[PDB]
């Protein structure tokens, strides 16, 4: 089992 | 102004 | 079993 | 201004 | 068994 | 501005 | 068994 | 403006 | 402005 | 079995 | 401004 | 099994 | 301005 | 400005 | 099994 | 089994 | 300014 | 500015 | 089993 | 089994 999280954040 | 975010779950 | 989630948000 | 989101689920 | 959910919102 | 959504569900 | 979405937007 | 969407199901 | 997402499930 | 998800999105 | 995410899984 | 998840923001 | 961030884990 | 990100998970 | 985290901030 | 990660971003 | 951090687990 | 990283691991 | 940490700031 | 981690960072 696997999981995967990704965040991108601009201004 | 920009945001993204993304998430994946596989058992 | 998996699942899957996306957001995307600009201003 | 935009803004869009999705989601999947598979058993 | 399945499902999908999606939205997209803008002004 | 606009604005669609959508659901898919599958047994 | 399978199922598809598609959402186009736009201003 | 425009927009559209679109759903396919097959079991 | 633009938007399109898409999702395909299959078992 | 397999899932996809694509979002795009650009002002 | 731009922005675009993609997942795949497979089982 | 394996996934992928991809993600590519700009201004 | 910029972040980003990412998990993934593998069982 | 620029950002990109991306995983690939393989059991 | 493994684990990765990945950060990045900039002003 | 393998993962990977990648990250780049830039102003 | 500037920042990243990394981190890996492998047992 | 800039700024990259990357983590590969394989059992 | 092995792990590794690395850390790089700037101003 | 092995790991790798590369990091670069630039103003």
């Given at each position: 089992?696997?999981?995967?999280?990704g965040m991108?954040?601009?201004?």
């Amino acid at each position: 089992s696997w999981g995967m999280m990704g965040m991108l954040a601009s201004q």
